[PDB]
Amino acid sequence: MRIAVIGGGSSYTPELVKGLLDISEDVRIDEVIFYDIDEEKQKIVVDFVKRLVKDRFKVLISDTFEGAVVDAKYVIFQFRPGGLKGRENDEGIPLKYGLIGQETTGVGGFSAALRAFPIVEEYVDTVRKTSNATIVNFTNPSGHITEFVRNYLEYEKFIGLCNVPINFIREIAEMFSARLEDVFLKYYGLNHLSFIEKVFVKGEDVTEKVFENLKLKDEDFPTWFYDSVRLIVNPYLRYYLMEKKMFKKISTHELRAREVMKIEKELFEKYRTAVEIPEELTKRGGSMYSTAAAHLIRDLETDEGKIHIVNTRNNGSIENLPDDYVLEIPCYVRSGRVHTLSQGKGDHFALSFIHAVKMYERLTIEAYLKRSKKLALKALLSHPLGPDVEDAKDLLEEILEANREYVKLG
Amino acid sequence: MRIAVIGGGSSYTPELVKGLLDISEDVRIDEVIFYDIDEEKQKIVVDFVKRLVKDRFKVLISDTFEGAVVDAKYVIFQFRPGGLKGRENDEGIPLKYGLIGQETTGVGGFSAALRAFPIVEEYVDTVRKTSNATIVNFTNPSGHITEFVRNYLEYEKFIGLCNVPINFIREIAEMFSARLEDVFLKYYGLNHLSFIEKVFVKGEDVTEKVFENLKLKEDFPTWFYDSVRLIVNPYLRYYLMEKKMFKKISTHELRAREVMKIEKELFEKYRTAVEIPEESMYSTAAAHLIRDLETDEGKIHIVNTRNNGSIENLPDDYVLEIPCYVRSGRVHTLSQGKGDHFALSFIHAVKMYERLTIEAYLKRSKKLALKALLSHPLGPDVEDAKDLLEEILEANREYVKLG
Amino acid sequence: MRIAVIGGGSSYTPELVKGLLDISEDVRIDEVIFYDIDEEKQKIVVDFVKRLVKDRFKVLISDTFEGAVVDAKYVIFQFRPGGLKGRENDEGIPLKYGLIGQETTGVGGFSAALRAFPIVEEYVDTVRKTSNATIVNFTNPSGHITEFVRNYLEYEKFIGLCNVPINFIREIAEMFSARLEDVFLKYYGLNHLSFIEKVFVKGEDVTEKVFENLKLEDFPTWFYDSVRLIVNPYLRYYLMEKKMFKKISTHELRAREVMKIEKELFEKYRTAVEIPEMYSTAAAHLIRDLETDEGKIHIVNTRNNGSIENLPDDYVLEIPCYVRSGRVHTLSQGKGDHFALSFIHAVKMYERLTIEAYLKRSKKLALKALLSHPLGPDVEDAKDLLEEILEANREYVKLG
Amino acid sequence: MRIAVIGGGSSYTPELVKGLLDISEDVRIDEVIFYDIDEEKQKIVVDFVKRLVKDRFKVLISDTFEGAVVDAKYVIFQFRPGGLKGRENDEGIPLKYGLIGQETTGVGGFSAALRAFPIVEEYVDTVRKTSNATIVNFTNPSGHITEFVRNYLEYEKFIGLCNVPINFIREIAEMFSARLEDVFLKYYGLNHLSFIEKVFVKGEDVTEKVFENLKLEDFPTWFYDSVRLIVNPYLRYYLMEKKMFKKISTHELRAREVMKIEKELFEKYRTAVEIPEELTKRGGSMYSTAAAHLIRDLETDEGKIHIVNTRNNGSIENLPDDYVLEIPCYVRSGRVHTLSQGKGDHFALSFIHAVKMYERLTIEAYLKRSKKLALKALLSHPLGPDVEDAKDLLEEILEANREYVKLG
């Protein structure tokens, strides 16, 4: 039983490995093998990992992608195509057009996806021709990449993960002094575009209590919003519903990527000597993506049967929506399989966003598969946060020049 | 055989009647009865109508709505709830928030729908308890109202009409020196939110020739047609060219104010006329539809109705604007295949907005109205929603009350 | 926390109660209240129950249906409309026409259903107007009744149960030395009309091993090689009609046998200190898991809702569900086999035609329903058959 | 503009040609080209054809299938795989098992289908790599073949035809003194498994009057009062199986009667100046008008209704989009559009679903060349064998069809 970690140099690696250590008591893990296109970055991180692991499983490095995944049962995608400079372009370029610049939402997520697709195509292909492992994905944009792998590359064992579902659950658990698994949600939407309609803790409906609580805590939704919409809304929906406010915010402060560059450079210096995971990591980004990955793999391994909110085909989870939409929804996870659960109908409000962005998602895939500039423009125009006709051509040209090393559109 | 016309004082009435006279040779019409809440406006128009009709059928006025529809086989809704003052509010109010102000699109159509729903509920109810007539609808927003009647009031014989499909068809017809019926389209979308994917003239695929000719006409650039590959309803300019349209609307006289002046001019002309003044084609659509509902010939009309498999990509119950086979009182939808992903993003988004709006009205809920307003692609940001709805509801005090 | 048991006089009651005793350690049960139209039958059984219970919860009798369900969280339907004399007619009458006579399959199930509908309509209405309890149903035909309540009476909390899914799991469990929950199935169909496509034990795919072990009046080897489905034994009546008809028609009717068995058990229950020599476990385990927040899999009858993507969402099917805190969620299974679907579709249409006939109280529509069943009459026999069914069921159903 | 006719030697050919001559005034036809595996049979028929046509268009014979379809805009499948001896096997073999033996219904249609698929696969493939013509199909079992081509070979321009829709329409037309196009139906089901729910003549709903008229070997009055559908007469095999079995099994096999009808028609063809009365009155001789009218209306931009075998696409909302059904379509300029009809009756659906599953099971058996899957398909048919008879029945069918189909 071996796990491959693709993008070993991620500054999140230590947390991932803590997670794998935590579960290595209920499931057998023989070796974890790491791969990164930045040999030197990974050396520092994996050296730190070795100190944390203390021979509880074997820590290995592979020179090639194929070498890492060849004998793997689980493959974790955790790499960032184009790196932080790519993120910086994603956040920075749309700004001049009066458009939201953000890592995974809107035009920023469009360029991130175009950067990712070629790499994931290559990677998924190699996995498929060798180990046929289950791929657990964090690489952003996670949901959009899942849609691409599930519905176009047609690789079934590809599960998109994100940090927000688990962050929400832990929040509720603390509020109600309960374990993570005591929390059961009606949850649906796309990655970073999701909605909670019902909250259950130890079987009790506590939705009303959660709403009343959310009102006692300018950049967040007003009370009337929750009264009217009656959904708990993913924080990323601020970019859609509070665009003017979010634009003024992003455009008048340092770009986020530049701040994470400084955080990562500080964490790396810490990693050269650190004997225990530093604080600096723990309270940032999505530090708890680690727990999600490790818990998912745990439950894929045992025959216990547990609920995980995961990115996968609808398959009747929301009867309101096509079976083949990849959604972020709670699933029954057991012995290598992921089963969707009945949830009933989705709210019209939520569906307006879900449908809009899903069409944009597939338009973008179509453009990439045909390598078409014309279809990319069509995709760009279809996003709710995309350019007006007067800006689209110039915007796309800026994107493609910035990403010339990663994607070529004719 | 009797036709009722609800909103007889519409400045469009003379054209409708011209249309009714043109078809009265292929189909029997005994009487046309008119109803309006403005008796004096209607007297002027109907006096003019009588001079055009010249006893070819009976022209009657009813003092009540029920009196008009009671023995009617067809009922035409052509009234404007809240009148032009209402339209002016619709266009004017959203402007202060940096939002598109327009008669049928965005926030403006939201308030127009809230004004319409109570009236059409009452009217549809009365028709249902009396004549069970086919209602042909022009009242805006036509598609949204159709969604409401077909899927919530559950009255099957309600057909939404609009002037764009016929305007396009005639355009193509004269480009190609062919009759109206020689033009066959792949056409789908919502009312004022519609797309043309394929154009056929006398059986020939002329799509490419249509695109090339569109390039030789505040309109879409050449590359847009190359990339999207759909002929797009001009109202999509409000979505796709919002900045440009906002700049235009907000630096010119509101359109409703212009219409007020045109209509005042037409009404002075109507007191004196013996023939229709040069100073609109919705008429032909209504009369031709009624003609074809009457005969057993079987003819294609683009109307607003339930999808039912016209676009396989879309739920059966979405009310769409689509080509149907019309024959002996019945409207059948036609196979068209799949709709484009780009088209569907608009269709899904505002269809959700449409139903959220209806739900808010049915429960008479301010909270639900905010929800609906937030859901429109051209709606307010959260910071402006509450103020904008309070302004809409004050302005529309007399027409709708939300709790 | 109170459970109501409708049809307390059922000879099965003892086992049900043993079941509720077993789970009364993981979940709190204050009282079990019984009701039966046969007061004397029930008194003997419930006196037996009191001896087994030994005051671990309160055992009560209600004079009225309303009195039983008024304060109940769970209501178990386990009555037999028309009794065994009704089942005797069900089994006996179709035989005359060369038709399969069977308690729940074919024309037999049709009359059983028409007998049930009026009663379940009344009972569901009273539950809905009082406690709004979850109804767990054994009353035959279980699945058809569930289709009726879920899609026509529109009462959501009505869960059809059957003893075949649990019988199968138990068999697999002991074949592989595993606990019941170690077994996971791809399972779908209608009640008494179900198929297993895949078998998992402790996560391992053992479908192949199950097929090989099944080959060691039942289907031949080649059948399993061809169809590649483990098939409910009731499918024998569709697939081996000639053989089944020959069997049913040359032996004592089954209901007659059961009458003798029940008369025997009843004399035993008068003095019996212990249960004399499996639906019970299903009911209790389901109630257990509805009560806790653990989350467990049960095969039950419910709306498809995407369990089988190949089938309409509203078909009531017998399928595995995730059960937890008063809620039943269906699980993804993928596509159903064309072979299975041909039976599922045909009898589902039959089921709704029958319900439509009942709701309109129409003889004409009943004929239509009768003709539509794969095991139903030919046109030449339909009218006589129906008139014989309605005659025998005079006291239970009137069709106009 | 060229029409290819595959199976030129069919004794129906003269009628088909009459049909093409009737429409050759509203649409242009330059040449009709014929192909048959029996050159001798065809020569006699086409010689007769030439005397009817009178140089109105050119009548040509092709030695090869490819040669016929290469330049065609329309290709008519009109052949009978295995011929009349094949039909005879289909009708005869099931009989010994107490099963309905019929040309297109039940076990008989199963073996007919397995005989057909290899040939239509080859033919569709060749059409697809050359002319891309619209194929109009009569070859039985028509609906099942259409399911196969539409959903498995994935050739879109393949339209299944049958003679019952037009026979019904014509009946109604005469009853009401109206033209064929004055008759509009709510019509759906499978080929030879179809139901009429509503009847309109000149826009009037005359369903009630049609039911009243139908009551003046056939369904009794109460049946129509109960089921309230006008049912295709082949449904007698399902609904009156005992009666139909007793009938078929105690009379000369139907195939043997048509052998003698055909032999008589061929003798007539040698010197006939005009179409004989025995051809007008037999088989499903009105299939001709259906073919010709369909092609006419695919050619013009008029827009006309034709009941045809095609994908559901929302015609019956109660049924999946991809079921091939026999349903009314809007036909115009090369395209076939499906019409809204609403919901299908539960009674009708039970037949439609059951046989549709059997149809796809049979196709899957053929495509995998699997004896095992064939047994599965056989067992799924409402009119199929019991488990005790299945194995023996299939081995008899495969033996008889050795030259047409091989299943491992």
CB B91 within 8 A of CB B103: yes
d(CA C342, CA D360): 11
The pairing of beta strand C134-137 with beta strand C158-160? parallel
Burial of D212 (0-12, 13-18, 19+ CB in 10 A): exposed
Say whether C184 and A342 touch across the interface (CB within 8 A).
Answer: no
DSSP state of A318: B
Q: Which amino acid is at D75?
A: V
Contact D331, D298 (CB under 8 A): yes
The sign one gets for the Cα dihedral D129, D130, D132, D135 is negative
d(CA C90, CA C385): 11
Give the span between the Cα atoms of A403 and A115, in whole angstroms: 7
- Of A210, A140, A141, nearest to A169 by C-alpha is A210
CA distances from D341 to A149, A181, B332, C352 (A): 39, 49, 7, 21
Q: Which CATH class is domain D81-105+161-408?
A: alpha beta
Of C239, C341, C349, the CB nearest to D387: C239
D408 exposure class (CB count in 10 Å sphere: 0-12, 13-18, 19+): exposed
Pair of tokens at residue D229: 């559908």
User: Which neighbouring-strand residues pair with C161?
Assistant: none
In angstroms, rounded to a whole number, what is the distance separating the alpha carbons of residues D316 and D267?
46
Task: Give Cβ neighbours of residue A36 (< 8 Å, ≥ 6 apart).
Answer: A6, A7, A8, A9, A42, A79
DSSP D339: B
Contact (CB<8Å) B333/D321: no
Q: What angle do CA B54, B56, B58 make, to 5 degrees?
A: 90
B381/A227 CB distance under 8 A: no
Breaks in chain B after residues (C–N exceeding 2.5 Å): 217, 279
Method used to obtain the model: X-ray
List Cα–Cα distances, A410 to A122, A393, A401, A406, in angstroms. 20, 14, 12, 14
Nearest CA to B310 out of A106, D338, D39 is that of D338
Q: How many helices (H) and strands (E) does chain D have?
A: 17, 13
What is the number of residues in chain D? 408
Helices (H), D54-187: 65-69, 83-92, 107-128, 142-148, 164-176
Identity at A211, one-letter amino acid code:
F
Q: How many residues does this entry show for chain A?
A: 410
Binding site, annotated residues of D for Mn(2+):
162, 192
Strands lying side by side in the sheet with D58-61: D58-61, D31-35, D2-6, D74-77, D134-137, D158-160, D304-311, D324-332, D335-338
The CA-based angle C10-C16-C22, given to 5 degrees, is 165
Query: Which residues of B have a CB under 8 Å from any CB of A?
Result: 220-221, 223-224, 226-228, 240-244, 341-342, 344-345, 348-349, 352-353, 355-356, 359, 366-371, 374-375, 377, 381-383, 386
Residue B356's identity, in one-letter code, is: L
Q: 3-state SS string over chain B?
A: CEEEEECCCCCCHHHHHHHHHHHCCCCCCCEEEEECCCHHHHHHHHHHHHHHHCCCCEEEECCCHHHHHCCCCEEEECCCCCHHHHHHHHHHHHHHHCCCCCCCCCHHHHHHHHHHHHHHHHHHHHHHHCCCCEEEECCCCHHHHHHHHHHCCCCCCEEECCCHHHHHHHHHHHHCCCCHHHEEEEEEEECCEEEEEEEEECCEECHHHHHHHHCCCCCCCHHHHHHHCCEECHHHHHHHCHHHHHHHHHCCCCHHHHHHHHHHHHHHHHCCCCCCCCCCCHHHHHHHHHHHHHCCCCEEEEEEEECCCCCCCCCCCCEEEEEEEEECCEEEEECCCCCCHHHHHHHHHHHHHHHHHHHHHHCCCHHHHHHHHHHCCCCCCHHHHHHHHHHHHHHCCCCCCCC
d(CA B99, CA B105): 11
Return the number of CB contacts < 8 Å for B and D. Answer: 65
Task: Looking at the complex, report in whole angstroms how far the Cα of residue C249 sits from the nearest Cα belonging to chain D.
Answer: 18
Alpha carbons C5 and B358: distance in angstroms, whole number = 45
User: How far is the C-alpha of C239 from the C-alpha of D386, rounded, in Å?
Assistant: 6
Give the Cα separation of C391 and B65 in Å (integer): 55
**Per-domain boundaries in chain C:** 2-80+106-160, 81-105+161-400
CA gap C175, C172 in Å, rounded: 5
Minimal CA–CA distance to C160: which of C150, C141, C146?
A: C146
Strand partners, C298: C321
Other Cβ atoms less than 10 A from the Cβ of A193: the count is 24
Listed by the residue before each break, gaps in chain D with C–N over 2.5 Å are 216
Q: Are B360 and B368 in contact (CB under 8 A)?
A: yes
The contacts of residue B218 (CB under 8 Å, 6+ apart) are B237, B241, B244, B245, B248
Q: Flag if A341 and C326 touch (Cβ within 8 Å).
A: no
Nearest-by-Cβ selection for C378 from D239, D346, D387 = D239
The whole-angstrom separation of Cα D231 and Cα D196 is 6
* D81 touches D44 (CB < 8 A): no
Closest CA to A19 of A76, A80, A81, A79: A76
Task: Answer for the pair C306, A340: CB distance below 8 angstroms, yes or no.
Answer: yes
Tokens in use for B171? Answer: 């355009």
Rounded-to-integer distance, Cα B8 and Cα B5, Å? 6
3-state secondary structure (DSSP) of residue D301: coil
Q: What tokens were used for A224?
A: 């009337």
Cα(D81)–Cα(D78) distance, rounded to whole angstroms?
10
Two structure tokens written together for A337: 């399989």
| A369 token code pair | 């598969």
Tell me how far the alpha carbon of residue D395 is from its chain's centroid.
27
Task: Report yes or no on chains A and D touching (3+ CB pairs under 8 A).
Answer: no
Cα distances from D25 to residues B207, C394, D34, D56, D292, in angstroms, run 30, 68, 21, 10, 12
What is the rounded distance in angstroms from the CA atom of residue C248 to the CA atom of residue C217?
12
Cα C208 versus chain centre, distance: 29
In angstroms, rounded to a whole number, what is the distance separating the alpha carbons of residues B18 and A180?
Answer: 72
Give the experimental resolution in Å. 2.8
Whole-number Å distance between alpha carbons of C2 and B403: 41
Cβ-based burial of B263 (10 A; exposed 0-12, middle 13-18, buried ≥19): middle
Is B335's CB within 8 Å of D338's CB?
yes
Which residues, other chains included, contact B278 with Cβ-Cβ below 8 Å and sequence gap of 6+? none
Q: Are β-strands D193-201 and D58-61 bridged in parallel, bridged antiparallel, or unpaired?
A: unpaired
With beta carbons less than 8 A apart as the criterion, state whether C136 and C159 touch.
yes
Q: Is C127 assigned to a binding site?
A: no
Strands (E), A78-116: none
DSSP string, D52-79: HHTTSSEEEE-SSHHHHHTT-SEEEE--
Return the structure tokens found at C3.
């459970």
Residues of D in Cβ contact (< 8 Å) with B334? 330, 337-339
3-state secondary structure of C229: coil
Q: Which helix (H) or strand (E) holds A376?
A: helix A373-382
Span A81-105+161-410: which CATH code?
3.90.110.10
Backbone dihedral region for residue C50 (phi beyond 0: left; psi -120 to 50: alpha; all else: beta): alpha
Asked if the domains D2-80+106-160 and D81-105+161-408 are classified in one and the same CATH topology, the answer is: no
Min CA distance, A332 vs chain B (Å)? 28
Mutate to test the interface with B, among D205, D337, D341 (most CBs of B within 10 A): D337
Q: Which is nearest to B2 in space by CA: B185, B189, B127?
A: B127
* CATH architecture of residue range(s) B81-105+161-403: Alpha-Beta Complex (3.90)
The CA distances from residue A66 to A40, A117, A139, D203, in Å, are: 19, 18, 18, 70
Rg (chain D; Cα; Å):
21
Residue positions of C annotated with a catalytic role: 234
Q: Which two tokens stand for residue A275?
A: 């004997």
**Is A236 among the catalytic positions?**
yes
Q: Which long-range contacts (CB under 8 A, 24 or more apart) does D315-319 make?
A: D315/B309, D315/D188, D315/D339, D315/D340, D315/D341, D316/D188, D316/D341, D316/D342, D316/D343, D316/D344, D317/B308, D317/B309, D317/B316, D317/D342, D317/D343, D318/D343, D318/D344, D318/D349, D319/D188, D319/D344, D319/D349, D319/D352
Report the distance separating Cα A19 and Cα A289, nearest Å.
Answer: 10
Q: Do D373 and C345 touch (CB under 8 A)?
A: no
CA distances from A82 to A41, A88, A89, A111, D219 (A): 15, 10, 10, 10, 75
Cβ-based contacts of C345 with chain D (< 8 Å): 349-350, 353-354, 357
Q: Are D90 and D109 in contact (CB under 8 A)?
A: yes
Question: Are D340 and B333 spatial neighbours (Cβ–Cβ below 8 Å)?
Answer: yes
Q: Which residues of D are catalytic?
A: 234
Structure token pair of residue A385: 């946060």
Integer CA distances (angstroms), A143 to A139, A314, A352, A362, in order: 9, 12, 17, 12
Q: How far apart are CA B43 and CA B62, in angstroms?
A: 11
Please state which of the four CATH numbers 2.70.180.20, 3.90.1150.10, 3.40.50.720, 3.90.110.10 is assigned to the domain occupying C81-105+161-400.
3.90.110.10
Task: Tell me which of B352, B383, B386 to substitute to probe the interface with A (most A C-beta atoms closer than 10 Å).
Answer: B352
| Residue C60 buriedness (CB in 10 A; 0-12 / 13-18 / 19+) | middle
**Which sign does the torsion angle of CA C48, C50, C53, C57 carry?**
positive
Q: Which residues contact C334 (CB under 8 A, 6 or more apart)?
A: C186, C308, C309
Touching pair C, D by Cβ (3+ pairs < 8 Å) = yes
Domain A2-80+106-160 sits in CATH 3.40.50.720: yes
From A74, A187, A188, A236, the catalytic residue:
A236
What's the half-sphere exposure (Cβ side, CA atoms, 13 Å) at A378?
26
- Residue D181 CB partners (closer than 8 Å, separation 6+): D304, D305
